[PDB]
Amino acid sequence: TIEIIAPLSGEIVNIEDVPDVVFAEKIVGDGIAIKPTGNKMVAPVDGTIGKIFETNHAFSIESDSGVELFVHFGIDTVELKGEGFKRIAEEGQRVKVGDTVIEFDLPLLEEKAKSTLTPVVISNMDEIKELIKLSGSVTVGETPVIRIKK
Amino acid sequence: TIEIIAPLSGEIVNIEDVPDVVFAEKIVGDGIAIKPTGNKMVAPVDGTIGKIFETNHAFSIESDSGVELFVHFGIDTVELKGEGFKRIAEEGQRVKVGDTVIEFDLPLLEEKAKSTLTPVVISNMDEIKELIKLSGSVTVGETPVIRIKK
Ligand SMILES: [Zn+2]
Ligand SMILES: [Zn+2]
């Protein structure tokens, strides 16, 4: 049983209500979304950064347990050409839950961005047995957001 | 105007309701208290660790602006002889808001401890002009807890 902890602070939303069919339709995979309230995206699991979008609004990670997660800030955020994001961690770096990955400017983003919702998804679903999504308000690197059986 | 940000997650309580007169009577100084909800104490300001109690349940800090804060986990926590606390940072180390200082075990502490309330206080009050305490639920290294004019 794996425990996925919040990469960022805010309220847990339904992947379904994410104004972007790639998320809403679970093309990319399944998980939850977060309506951000903080200033950073942290590592939800222990493992290794995989990729960090140029723009710095999204990143990949693969835990030691074998889970591949994809955190992606906002919708259409690429349009901001990397404006509001400071890349703290490095591609392929070894991380532990809670290690800061990216730092953002909510206020800015809130205004200049299409949407603030941040999808948190498991990219290797075929390797998934059970996925239990939680609910409520969460805090960075502290609160669990999903329970997996794999 | 300085901004003191939450060292830990939880709800902001009244220093006054802290079951320990040293806090409740403002002997040590003034601030707020937090009813913890997370798993770590982070640096509320940018500056330098000053002291770290042997037991690891409390620590001092002095920001670059000239504020001396004292974060102290729970009441009578020394009684636990350092049980439930992992000292992450080091005495006299340079830190930035959000850098983990100590890691704790709430569950444990919640059970074995007298009280969980954590006073957050400014130790050099004489250097203080104005102190504005905020209220509500806060998240680690994100939410502001106090506004100072000094
Ligand atoms: Zn994108
Ligand atoms: Zn003590």
Side-chain angles (χ1 to χ4, degrees), chain A residues 1-34 36-53 55-80 82-85 87-89 91-95 97-110 112-113 115-148 150, chain B residues 1-34 36-53 55-80 82-85 87-89 91-95 97-110 112-113 115-148 150:
Chain A
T1 197
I2 303 132
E3 217 181 5
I4 286 135
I5 310 143
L8 73 178
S9 279
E11 261 110 24
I12 289 188
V13 180
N14 275 318
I15 206 67
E16 304 89 3
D17 335 311
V18 187
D20 180 346
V21 265
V22 73
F23 299 114
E25 289 240 295
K26 310 161 196 215
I27 303 273
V28 227
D30 208 358
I32 49 90
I34 304 181
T37 241
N39 65 129
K40 72 197 83 154
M41 277 180 286
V42 136
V45 280
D46 296 297
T48 326
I49 283 38
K51 162 126 116 116
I52 315 208
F53 286 25
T55 352
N56 294 309
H57 71 281
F59 71 93
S60 264
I61 203 198
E62 98 214 52
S63 72
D64 299 349
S65 29
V67 187
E68 285 174 48
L69 291 115
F70 176 51
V71 186
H72 180 286
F73 189 101
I75 296 321
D76 272 288
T77 341
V78 73
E79 260 356 77
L80 285 187
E83 195 217 338
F85 307 95
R87 168 182 194 151
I88 280 11
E91 204 133 31
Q93 175 186 334
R94 258 238 113 254
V95 304
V97 162
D99 293 355
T100 289
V101 171
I102 314 169
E103 295 175 352
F104 57 87
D105 207 309
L106 215 56
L108 190 172
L109 309 173
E110 280 202 325
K112 314 250 302 262
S115 190
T116 250
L117 321 174
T118 307
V120 180
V121 334
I122 276 102
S123 32
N124 62 337
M125 283 304 284
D126 312 54
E127 277 114 280
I128 246 70
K129 300 256 241 354
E130 197 154 66
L131 184 59
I132 289 121
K133 320 186 186 180
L134 309 179
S135 65
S137 318
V138 283
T139 46
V140 228
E142 300 183 323
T143 317
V145 303
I146 285 148
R147 259 312 154 130
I148 82 247
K150 145 249 191 358
Chain B
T1 197
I2 303 132
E3 217 181 5
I4 286 135
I5 310 143
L8 73 178
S9 279
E11 261 110 24
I12 289 188
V13 180
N14 275 318
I15 206 67
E16 304 89 3
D17 335 311
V18 187
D20 180 346
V21 265
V22 73
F23 299 114
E25 289 240 295
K26 310 161 196 215
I27 303 273
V28 227
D30 208 358
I32 49 90
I34 304 181
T37 241
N39 65 129
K40 72 197 83 154
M41 277 180 286
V42 136
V45 280
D46 296 297
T48 326
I49 283 38
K51 162 126 116 116
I52 315 208
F53 286 25
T55 352
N56 294 309
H57 71 281
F59 71 93
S60 264
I61 203 198
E62 98 214 52
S63 72
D64 299 349
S65 29
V67 187
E68 285 174 48
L69 291 115
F70 176 51
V71 186
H72 180 286
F73 189 101
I75 296 321
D76 272 288
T77 341
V78 73
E79 260 356 77
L80 285 187
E83 195 217 338
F85 307 95
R87 168 182 194 151
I88 280 11
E91 204 133 31
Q93 175 186 334
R94 258 238 113 254
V95 304
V97 162
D99 293 355
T100 289
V101 171
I102 314 169
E103 295 175 352
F104 57 87
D105 207 309
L106 215 56
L108 190 172
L109 309 173
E110 280 202 325
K112 314 250 302 262
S115 190
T116 250
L117 321 174
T118 307
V120 180
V121 334
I122 276 102
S123 32
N124 62 337
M125 283 304 284
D126 312 54
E127 277 114 280
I128 246 70
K129 300 256 241 354
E130 197 154 66
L131 184 59
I132 289 121
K133 320 186 186 180
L134 309 179
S135 65
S137 318
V138 283
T139 46
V140 228
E142 300 183 323
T143 317
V145 303
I146 285 148
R147 259 312 154 130
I148 82 247
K150 145 249 191 358

